[PDB]
């Protein structure tokens, strides 16, 4: 038999309501660079039914680069 | 395989080497056997490269019917390969007819019917009679030897090719080169006719 | 299940990979976490299955 | 309907390959902007004809994957024993960067000659045929390719700059799974997209 | 027979796959092999215990691991990039006007193996090899000599240095084998197409320095030098550049050959011309003469491939016969080709 | 198969002597012995046992750090066993057998004396030094053309009198993984300490000895060792070499171990090279080759050719039976090939003057 599954094993997750988290909204220099995270996180997660009706897959792609800064 | 096939390309190097590969020990003393029809075409290639890991066993039955398979079918035409092949030979140490039976059946091979004057010079082939008559001491196979030499050497008058250039084949040789493969007494002695 | 269960213990269980086949009949395979082994025929498949 | 007959014709037709007297074709390229389609020409086709597709390195890793070490080049030219007809390609060396004038000469030098000893061992020795390769570039080493080319050995195509033509229909291509009404206009919105690529 | 029905139970029920490493002179075989497990094997059997050597795998018992058996496994990088096999059809009837050249090197393609009995009724041992070279981009034209040697023994071609300059040495060592392996293929024919060693300059992945490079190709001399080599493998070398090369390689072999490839001269291009449009059916005003006669300093390799222009528009109509209309006309792509390309 | 049927008669006893000794696995080094019964050892299985022996084994008879025989169940000591390193590339660098002797030499006679006397003059009598000795040399210099190199070594191939001595390629020194041919280099010398005084010789000792440095960045690093390393393995006190050294170069760079050889080594000599008269042994290399016609002569050949070496003026006489087999002449006369000789010197001289001079300047 397998697991039920799972419990899993390494980590796991949570990391917000048993801390840290950090408020973003003291630095809004970023603004155009949370341009893509805007439209690349909230609905990509939240609607999988709006990408059958666009007409258009949502990618996995998303990048960072630079540091520092 | 050796008869019943005759045509101008070999042909028969499959179910020749067929026969060897698949037959039982001690048949492939007869397999050589072949070599004096087929291997007119181009004897030089094939003969010399076979037989030559042939030539070195120890079975001294083998090693009469390899020198022997040679024999006249590549005694046509001469090369240094030979002449510097003839060394080494003579000098084993091993008794019975075979070891003279190899050696001296292997200088006739220079050339048939061919000199002395006009062309190639019988100091030489005097002088390797004489050198090669000096061991054991007789051993009067080495008189044997050194008239056998000059059976076919001092003869000549005789131009073969092949026999025959015309095709026809020697209804002696063939005959007479059959009975010695197992020569015990007298019977290599009808076969000196030749 | 339990002759099975009983079969599997003293001995295991893993996947080979056949890399070379024998006269002998034996086969070259891998013990692939280790390795190699040469092992023979394995009367049901025969050499020339595989 | 220039790399068609490149294709086909040694997979379809090749018995009268000697009816005219020459062999297969040893490669082709496409130069031009980097450019769109290329690729897509290249498995594509393969496609079209089944034929399987290949790629040049590769990384990293699929490299000692196959074999341990070598010229390296052998094993990929057996994979094609495998399987034929079969696709090869030049993934991607096709950009204005890679040049540096001398450090990126060697890289793709041998990249070079992963078509010629490639080439070396399909017109050179071996067999037989339904293998091919690609090449891709603008400039540069397309001009270096004439330093490979004197003639010897394989087939210049140039890759096109994209015009209104391709801009409407490939729009609609792209267009059949989206959802849109048919008032949109086709005029405008091929002709306010001039240049760019492709993609 | 019953030995046959002996020995299997000690050799039962299964059998590794060991590495054979180092002997007890004694003939104890040490052995490492996965993880690091030795051995004893003083066995009687199937040895041949000298040659089986260092350096080798064996196969184990499991009680206790002694080696029953032996085997050469390959496959492997080494003989594939060798091989096989090949002779294409090609021969050298097919280049004509250079036989000054070739009859040269015939006595070099033939002494060895065929014919060989006047190199030693001479004595004077002429065993060098050959080197080869020429313009523009030659080589191939030194393949349609190299077609026809694979009429005898064995061939292999190789190019350039680059499986050395992959990586960080890694020594000679894939040339070392590829080396002497033509020992084990021996008698055989090994060649390497334009040396680029020094030619060009950068390398692909990871290669560094000069001096790695410069002796990778010291070593390809040196151990070629030999101490002390027999061994042929008569070595085949060409480079189209004969700068770059160390002058050095040419005194220990190959001494006697290097090969001048002269450019096409008027009749040859006629000589070599007609060979092609043989299969390729003219046209009635096709001329074999005058447009080569007017074109200048050409190659075999386009006065080839200057066919195959009509076989693409010919073809395209499919037409079994060339059109000069279009084979002069279409020339131009072939001459667009040299000339602004 | 008599030979492969007595081959499989007698694993009966070896399978009745397979009980014993069999279990000698894992050779295995000794760490520490404290006091008299005990005992730690140390194996590359990743096993480290501090543990006893079986009593064939002797205490003082053995020493630290040792790879021995062991039965893994006791973890006993079952014998020492003294070797340890290295793997076939050894093998493939040591070499045996003999060929190419003295008479060989093209003419060349106190060029190669002066070398004759430091290596197997000693050697013929070690004993020669008990009186009189002092020493036989540290080491040699030898660098110039290709003839001629390493036949010298194949000159001491062949009449070497005692044990084979052992070639060095060298681009198999310069290695990935750095410090690979380190090891080889401090551990071949007591693998050639286990054949006692055996001698070696090193090729392409200019491109392995590589000197000096750039600021940056080696590259020559792990290199700069193995120089300087040889030069450890050069100033290690012991014997030094009781194999004494011969050693052939191109170029006089390297620098340090040619600076470091006044601080050790001894005997700077050179080629020959080629010379007005041993040209006619080069040419009598192949006097009893053919057969000479009478009229052919060896100073009408041997004036005309300066600069010759040993190697092309070798093939020079050779290139007659090349033109004789080609044009069916039944012996050549000196006419025929000088034909093709002063051809074959300004054929191959046009584009290479093979400048020797300028190698080393
Ligand atoms: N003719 C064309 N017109 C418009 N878009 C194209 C055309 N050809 C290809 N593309 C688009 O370009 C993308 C990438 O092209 P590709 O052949 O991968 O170029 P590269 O190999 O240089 O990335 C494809 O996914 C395709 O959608
Ligand atoms: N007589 C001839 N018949 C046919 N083809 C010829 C003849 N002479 C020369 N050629 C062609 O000229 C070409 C020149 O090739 P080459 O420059 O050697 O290419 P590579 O770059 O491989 O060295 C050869 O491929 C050969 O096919
Ligand atoms: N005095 C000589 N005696 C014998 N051979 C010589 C002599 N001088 C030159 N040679 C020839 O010169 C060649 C030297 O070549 P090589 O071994 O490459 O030298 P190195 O090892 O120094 O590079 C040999 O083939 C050798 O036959």
Redesign the pocket.
């Known amino acids: 038999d397998v697991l039920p599954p799972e419990a899993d094993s390494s980590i796991m997750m949570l990391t917000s309501d048993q801390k840290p988290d950090v408020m973003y909204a003291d630095i809004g220099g970023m603004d155009i660079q949370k341009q893509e995270v805007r439209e690349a996180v909230e609905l990509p997660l939240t609607h999988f039914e709006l990408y059958k009706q666009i007409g258009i897959d949502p990618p996995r792609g998303v990048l960072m680069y630079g540091p520092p800064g | 395989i050796a008869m019943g096939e005759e045509i101008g390309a070999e042909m028969a190097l499959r179910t020749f080497g067929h026969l060897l590969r698949y037959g039982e020990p001690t048949l492939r003393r007869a397999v050589p056997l072949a070599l004096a029809l087929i291997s007119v075409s181009n004897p030089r290639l094939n003969i010399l490269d076979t037989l030559s890991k042939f030539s070195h066993d120890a079975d001294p039955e083998v090693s009469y019917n390899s020198i022997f398979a040679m024999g006249m079918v590549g005694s046509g035409t001469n090369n240094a390969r030979l002449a510097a092949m003839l060394r080494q030979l003579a000098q084993y140490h091993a008794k019975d007819p075979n070891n003279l039976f190899m050696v001296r059946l292997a200088q006739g091979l220079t050339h048939l019917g061919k000199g002395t004057l006009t062309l190639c010079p019988y100091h030489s082939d005097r002088q390797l009679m004489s050198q090669v008559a000096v061991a054991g001491l007789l051993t009067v196979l080495v008189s044997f030897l050194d008239v056998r030499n000059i059976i076919l050497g001092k003869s000549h008058y005789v131009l073969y090719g092949l026999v025959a250039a015309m095709q026809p084949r020697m209804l002696v040789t063939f005959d007479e080169e059959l009975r010695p493969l197992p020569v015990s007494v007298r019977v290599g002695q009808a076969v000196d006719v030749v | 299940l339990r002759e099975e269960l009983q079969l599997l213990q003293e001995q295991g269980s893993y996947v080979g990979e056949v890399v070379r086949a024998m006269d002998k009949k034996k086969v070259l395979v891998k013990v692939h976490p280790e390795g190699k082994f040469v092992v023979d025929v394995d009367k049901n498949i025969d050499i020339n299955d595989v | 309907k220039e790399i068609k007959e490149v294709i086909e014709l040694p997979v379809k037709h090749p018995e009268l390959f000697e009816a005219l007297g020459i062999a297969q074709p040893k490669g082709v390229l496409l130069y031009g902007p980097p450019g769109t389609g290329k690729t897509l020409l290249a498995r594509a086709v393969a496609h079209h004809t089944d034929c399987t597709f290949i790629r040049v390195s590769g990384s990293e890793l699929v490299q000692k994957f196959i074999g341990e070490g070598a010229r390296m080049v052998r094993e990929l030219f057996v994979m094609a024993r495998e399987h034929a007809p079969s696709i090869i390609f030049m993934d991607e060396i096709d950009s204005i960067g890679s040049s540096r004038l001398e450090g990126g000469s060697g890289g793709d030098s041998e990249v070079q000659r992963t078509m010629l000893e490639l080439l070396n061992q399909l017109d050179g020795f071996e067999a037989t045929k339904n293998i091919k390769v690609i090449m891709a570039t603008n400039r540069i080493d397309i001009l270096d390719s004439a330093l490979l080319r004197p003639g010897r050995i394989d087939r210049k195509i140039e890759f096109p700059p994209p015009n209104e033509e391709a801009r409407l229909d490939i729009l609609k291509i792209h267009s059949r799974k989206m959802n849109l009404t048919r008032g949109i206009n086709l005029r405008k919105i091929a002709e306010l997209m001039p240049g760019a690529s492709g993609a | 027979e019953e030995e046959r029905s002996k020995v299997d139970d000690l050799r039962g029920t299964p059998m590794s796959v060991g590495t054979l490493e180092e002997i007890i002179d004694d003939n104890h075989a040490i052995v490492s092999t996965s993880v690091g497990s030795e051995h004893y094997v003083s066995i009687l059997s199937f040895v041949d215990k000298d040659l089986l050597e260092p350096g080798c795998s064996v196969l184990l018992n499991h009680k206790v691991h002694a080696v029953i058996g032996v085997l050469m496994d390959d496959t492997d990088p080494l003989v594939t990039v060798m091989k096989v096999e090949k002779a294409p059809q090609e021969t050298y009837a097919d280049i004509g006007g250079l036989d000054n050249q070739i009859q040269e090197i015939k006595e070099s393609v033939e002494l060895p193996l065929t014919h060989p009995e006047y190199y030693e009724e001479m004595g004077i041992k002429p065993p060098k090899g050959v080197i080869l070279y020429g313009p523009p981009g030659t080589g191939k034209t030194l393949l349609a000599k190299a077609v026809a040697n694979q009429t005898s023994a064995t061939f292999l071609r190789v190019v350039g240095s680059e499986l050395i300059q992959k990586y960080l040495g890694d020594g000679p060592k894939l040339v070392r084998e590829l080396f002497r392996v033509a020992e084990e293929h021996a008698p055989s024919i090994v060649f390497i197409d334009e040396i680029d060693a020094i030619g060009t300059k950068r390398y692909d992945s990871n290669s560094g320095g000069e001096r790695e490079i410069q002796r990778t190709m010291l070593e390809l ?2 151990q070629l ?3 002390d080599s027999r061994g042929d493998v008569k070595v085949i070398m060409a480079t189209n550049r004969i700068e770059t090369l160390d002058p ?1 390689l040419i ?2 072999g190959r001494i006697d050959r290097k090969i001048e490839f002269p450019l096409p001269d008027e009749k040859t291009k006629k000589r070599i011309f007609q060979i092609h449009t043989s299969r390729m059916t003219l046209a009635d005003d096709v001329t074999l003469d005058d447009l080569i006669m007017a074109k200048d300093d050409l190659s075999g390799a386009d006065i080839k491939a200057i066919c195959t222009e009509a076989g693409l528009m010919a073809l395209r109509e499919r037409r079994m016969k060339v059109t000069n209309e279009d084979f002069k006309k279409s020339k131009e792509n072939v001459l667009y080709k040299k000339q602004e390309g | 198969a008599p030979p492969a049927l007595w081959d499989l008669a007698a694993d009966k006893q070896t399978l009745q002597s397979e009980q014993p000794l069999q279990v000698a696995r894992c050779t295995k080094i000794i760490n520490a012995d404290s006091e008299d019964p005990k005992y730690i050892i140390n194996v590359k299985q990743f096993a480290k046992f501090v543990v006893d022996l079986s009593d064939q084994v002797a205490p003082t008879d053995i020493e630290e750090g040792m790879r021995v025989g062991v039965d893994r169940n006791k973890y006993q000591i079952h014998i020492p066993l003294p070797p340890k390193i290295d793997p076939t590339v050894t093998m493939m660098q040591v070499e045996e057998k003999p060929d190419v002797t003295y008479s ?5 006679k106190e060029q ?1 004396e002066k070398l004759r006397e430091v290596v197997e003059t000693p050697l013929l009598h070690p004993e020669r030094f008990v009186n009189l000795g002092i020493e036989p040399p540290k080491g040699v210099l030898l660098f ?8 010298l070594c194949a000159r001491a191939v062949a009449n070497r009198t005692d044990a084979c001595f052992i070639r060095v390629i060298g681009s198999e020194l310069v290695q990935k993984y750095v410090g690979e041919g380190a090891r080889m280099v401090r551990e071949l010398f007591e693998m050639a300490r286990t054949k006692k005084a055996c001698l070696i010789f090193f ?1 392409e000792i200019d491109a392995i000895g590589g000197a000096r440095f750039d600021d940056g960045a080696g590259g020559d690093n792990e290199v700069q060792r193995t120089m300087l390393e040889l030069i450890n393995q050069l100033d290690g006190f012991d014997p030094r070499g009781n194999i004494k050294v011969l050693m ?1 170069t ?1 170029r006089p760079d390297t620098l340090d171990p040619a600076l470091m050889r006044p601080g050790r080594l001894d005997r700077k000599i050179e ?2 090279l080629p010379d007005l008269e ?1 040209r006619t ?2 040419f009598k ?1 192949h006097a009893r080759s053919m057969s000479v016609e009478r009229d052919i002569r060896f100073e009408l050949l041997a004036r005309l050719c300066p600069n010759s ?3 092309e003026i ?1 093939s020079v006489c050779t290139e007659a039976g090349m033109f004789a087999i080609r044009a069916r002449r039944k012996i050549a006369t000196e006419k025929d090939f000088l034909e093709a000789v002063n051809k074959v010197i300004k054929s191959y001289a046009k584009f290479s003057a093979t400048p020797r001079y300028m190698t080393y300047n």
């Not at chain 6, 110039?144 to 036949?151: F, L, Q, R, V």
């Open positions: 001399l040196n030098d030999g101490f050095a005194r220990p | 060989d030499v093209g003419g060349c190669i110039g053309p290709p003839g001629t190199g390493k036949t090729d052939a191109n080629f020959s041993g042994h080069i290399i070496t040993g190697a070798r």
